[PDB]
Design a protein around this nucleic acid. Structure first.
Ligand SMILES: Nc1ncnc2c1ncn2[C@@H]1O[C@H](COP(=O)(O)OP(=O)(O)OP(=O)(O)O)C[C@H]1O
Ligand SMILES: [Mg+2]
Ligand SMILES: [Zn+2]
Lengths: 89, 76, 99, 48, 166, 122, 86, 97, 50, 34
RNA sequence: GCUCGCUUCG
């Protein structure tokens, strides 16, 4: 399914990986570092941190695994607290 | 309410880690530990007693979210 | 040996050891035996709380020589580390603040 | 009396925008101009 | 005095979880915004109220409780024509040094508009006779950090008459 | 740390006085050692602003009195700044309204001043 | 071999050739005066749209006295497409 | 460092990272490859997206938009080398919320 | 492994969250079966089968 | 001198391949890492 | 301390 989700059978080689993926950092890290980096600098393509490889490189928790969701604290609170009335207005 | 009611192992690991990190930073204990010097053991005791004050915020890929309590979810 | 493959995707870390293995059937499948020598070097930072205070006190009192113990103390207010091999360890144990 | 300035913010990088720099931007970013081809001084201290 | 709406990301450590969230949020906001001047806003006094308080996240980093809080706080910022009553906490030859009562010693009235008997001879002489009134004129703020105060304002004292004190 | 509006709503000194008294009583009922030691500027600014307001005639005020004063001044087509200054200062003498209060020309009418004094003194 | 330089070249190197003096005459001065007049008269023209001031502090009785008044030109909506009508 | 005679530590190779990814342990991978190996705190200017020093941006000659950021030191080295290669990475920072 | 000179590495996490994630997700009791085909890998071996 | 106790007993003592100039009286780590 | 080569180890 990963090889056949864009309508064309794309291989696991660098060409198919470039045609499938969009992240500049992963394309540079896998193969053809300088070429991909210079092409990205020419195109000015902004690369997000959605992928796992860029999350590992930039030192942030990856979106896959335990980092897909967020946790909330069950603290004793009261949303929308009563507001002090304005006397002059 | 549409997701799986069972609490996954990743949620378990993350909740236990957050609870252990909090307890290690002088957080109040709600299970009255009996000689447990390891914060992870205290977190596991709180999870088994279902007294962890943490609400998981499951995010859908499109952007929607939903809140599930630890006591509300099913543990194995 | 580039930056991406040698320094970004895979990089060397500390607090790790490497040793030859030998069989031991008397241990559980989820347990592993660690030598005393490596255990005295690989340290774990435990935060002083209301639960393990009396345990960390005894650990500091033992010192870096006895196996159950510690090697360094980082205060909550100041981040200046203190070596347990020098100075009065009893005074440091008696002055273990939370955090 | 005292101005309110934030000490530290939990900033998270969103995305990296690659690009190029003009020579004027290269001059503005740099601090000093390197014109000497030698490395160290003639004295025995060999200071840069 | 005027209300200002602010949105702040407050971090509460885990050892304050037994306390009520709103009380600790108010305490932290007051500790963060006491005796400080916000640029283009003025000197904030304290927190007035908390309007909106959304969910409290816990980050995989520090592990504390981060809450985005919308609140209204009181600040001291005249409207370029307000009348104030201060006390003379000093005087310079180029201008008197009046200070609002225990509030802020930043009011520097220029002595260039009174009747033509204006001068300060360094002996704390206010003005030659023919609770001190003040008319704020313009606000001005400045930054502090510029290498690897901020509120003075101009004060007017016109020919108010002042039958009580010259 | 951005502000939404620095001029959202002007308030008189009575609201500030009430807020300061409430904060002072809540502090003295919930005094914390480490919280106070972390920042002592809060206590200083609150106490000194409360003392400054106490030096002013801002005492003996209530929300009902402020509402009555506002309803009385609404018939005089005065601006919000003028009534705010009159409430904060509480002028007992006419000369305070004659000269000190701005926009004196064409507004005093030499007859409304007595009504203004009667309203502010009540 | 070329010598080594201890200090960087000057930020503005000197030149032995100076710019030719400007042309003189009644025409150049008249054109200069007319350009200055155009600069002075085109900012007050209604075509010169200024930045709309916002965030008024208070409303006052003097607002009517300080209210800026200026005639506004009416664009010909017959030639201009419908998308620019207010 | 690398060798035992050089008193070096063990290396979490690419396949170890792959195994940690397959397990889904994001926090453990972050602690191993960022916190415990090459953690550093840099100063990034939110206006131009360049790296500053001591809370100051020499490019913009200002310090209001400079903010601290945690980062692997190898990543900062890569960014500096790319800036040397005229491939300027401009970082657009934002709040963690 | 075959205990004929194998050198193995031993890492110590420096975070409570990392420790908990390692114990939960990478627990020996929780990974008794491979994800390839579900067959159990941690089982009896020579001198235990005999 | 030691920054804590002010003593001048600063000895270079390496602790398990860690170059460290430390005070000999109170054990205050003056400098570490090479 | 950087580099390279050989050598072993599983
Ligand atoms: N180049 C290598 N890459 C990966 N693993 C290796 C390599 N060389 C040795 N090993 C390790 O050693 C093990 C190889 O042993 P194996 O080939 O199964 O037995 P053997 O060496 O043929 O012994 P016998 O000759 O059968 O007695 C498996 C692997 O983890
Ligand atoms: Mg082997
Ligand atoms: Zn900049």
């Amino acid at each position: 399914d990963l090889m056949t989700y864009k309508g064309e059978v794309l291989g696991i080689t660098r060409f198919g990986l470039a045609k499938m993926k969009e992240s500049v950092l992963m394309l540079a890290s896998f193969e053809k570092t300088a070429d991909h980096l210079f092409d990205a600098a020419y195109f000015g393509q902004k690369d997000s941190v959605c992928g796992v490889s860029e999350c590992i490189i930039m030192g942030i928790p990856m979106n896959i695994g335990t980092g897909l969701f967020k946790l909330l604290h069950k603290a004793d609170r009261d949303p929308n607290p009563p507001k002090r009335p304005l006397i002059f207005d | 309410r549409i997701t799986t009611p069972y609490m996954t192992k990743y949620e378990r690991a993350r909740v236990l880690g957050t609870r252990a990190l909090q307890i290690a930073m002088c957080a109040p204990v709600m299970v009255e530990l009996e000689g447990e010097t390891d914060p992870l053991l205290i977190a596991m005791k709180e999870l088994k007693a279902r007294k962890i004050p943490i609400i998981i915020r499951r995010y859908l890929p499109d952007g929607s979210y939903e809140d599930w309590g630890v006591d509300e979810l099913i543990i194995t | 040996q580039g930056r991406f493959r040698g320094n970004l995707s895979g990089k060397r870390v500390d607090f790790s050891g490497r040793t030859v293995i030998s069989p031991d059937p008397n241990l559980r499948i989820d347990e592993v035996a660690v030598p005393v020598h490596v255990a005295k070097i690989l340290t774990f930072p435990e935060k002083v709380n209301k639960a393990n205070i009396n345990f960390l006190r005894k650990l500091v009192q033992n010192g870096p020589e006895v196996h159950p113990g510690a090697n360094f103390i980082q205060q909550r207010h100041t981040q200046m580390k203190r070596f347990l091999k020098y100075g009065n360890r009893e005074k440091m144990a008696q002055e273990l603040k939370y955090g | 009396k005292e101005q309110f300035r934030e000490t530290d913010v939990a900033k998270k990088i969103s995305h990296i925008c690659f690009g190029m720099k003009s020579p004027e931007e290269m001059r503005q970013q740099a601090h000093i101009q390197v014109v000497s081809k030698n490395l160290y001084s003639q004295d025995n201290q060999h200071a840069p | 005095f005027v209300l200002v709406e602010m949105v702040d990301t407050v971090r509460i450590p885990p050892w304050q979880f037994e306390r009520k969230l709103n009380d600790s949020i108010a305490e932290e906001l007051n500790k963060k915004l006491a005796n400080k001047v916000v640029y283009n806003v003025g000197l904030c006094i304290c927190l007035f109220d908390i309007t909106k308080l959304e969910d409290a996240y816990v980050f995989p980093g520090d592990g504390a409780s981060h809450t985005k809080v919308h609140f209204r706080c009181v600040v001291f910022h005249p409207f370029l024509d307000e009348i104030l009553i201060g006390k003379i906490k000093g005087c310079s030859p180029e201008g008197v040094h009046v200070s609002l009562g225990f509030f802020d010693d930043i009011l520097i009235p220029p002595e260039s508009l009174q009747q033509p008997a204006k001068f300060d001879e360094a002996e704390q002489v206010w003005v030659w006779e023919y609770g001190e009134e003040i008319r704020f004129r313009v606000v001005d703020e400045s930054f502090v950090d510029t290498s690897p105060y901020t509120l003075v304002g101009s004060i007017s004292e016109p020919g108010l008459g002042l039958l009580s004190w010259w | 740390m951005e502000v939404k509006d620095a001029n959202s709503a002007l308030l008189s000194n009575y609201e500030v006085f009430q807020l300061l008294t409430d904060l002072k009583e809540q502090r003295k009922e919930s005094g914390k050692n480490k919280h106070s030691s972390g920042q002592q500027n809060l206590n200083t600014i609150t106490y000194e602003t409360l003392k400054y307001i106490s030096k002013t005639p801002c005492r003996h005020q209530s929300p009902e009195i402020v509402r009555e004063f506002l309803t009385a001044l609404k018939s005089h087509k005065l601006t919000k700044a003028e009534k705010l200054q009159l409430l904060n200062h509480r002028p007992v003498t006419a000369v305070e309204i004659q000269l000190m209060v701005e926009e004196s020309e064409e507004r005093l009418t030499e007859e409304q001043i007595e009504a203004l004094l009667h309203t502010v003194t009540s | 071999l070329p010598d080594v330089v201890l200090k960087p070249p000057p930020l503005f190197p000197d030149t032995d050739y100076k710019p030719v003096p400007l042309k003189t005459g009644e025409g150049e001065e008249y054109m200069l005066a007319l350009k200055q007049e155009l600069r002075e008269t085109m900012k007050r023209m209604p075509y010169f749209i200024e930045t709309p001031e916002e965030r008024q502090d208070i409303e006052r009785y003097s607002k009517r006295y300080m209210k800026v008044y200026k005639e506004e030109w009416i664009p010909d909506w017959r030639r201009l497409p419908r998308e620019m009508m207010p | 460092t690398e060798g035992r005679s050089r008193d070096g530590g063990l290396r979490l190779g690419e396949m170890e990272r792959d195994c940690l990814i397959g397990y889904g342990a994001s926090m453990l991978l972050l602690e191993r490859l960022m916190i415990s190996s090459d953690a550093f705190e840099v100063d990034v200017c939110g206006q131009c997206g360049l790296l500053g020093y001591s809370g100051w941006c020499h490019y913009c000659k200002s310090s209001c938009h400079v903010s601290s950021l945690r980062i692997p030191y190898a990543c900062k080295l890569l960014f500096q080398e790319l800036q040397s290669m005229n491939i300027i990475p401009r970082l657009k920072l934002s709040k963690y919320n | 492994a075959d205990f004929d000179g194998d050198e193995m590495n031993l890492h110590l996490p420096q975070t409570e969250e990392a420790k908990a994630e390692a114990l939960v997700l990478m627990g020996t009791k929780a990974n008794l079966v491979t994800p390839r085909n579900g067959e159990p890998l941690i089982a009896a071996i020579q001198d235990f089968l005999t | 001198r030691c920054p804590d106790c002010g003593s001048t007993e600063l000895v270079e003592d390496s602790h398990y391949s860690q170059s460290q100039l430390v005070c000999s009286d109170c054990g205050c780590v003056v400098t570490e890492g090479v």
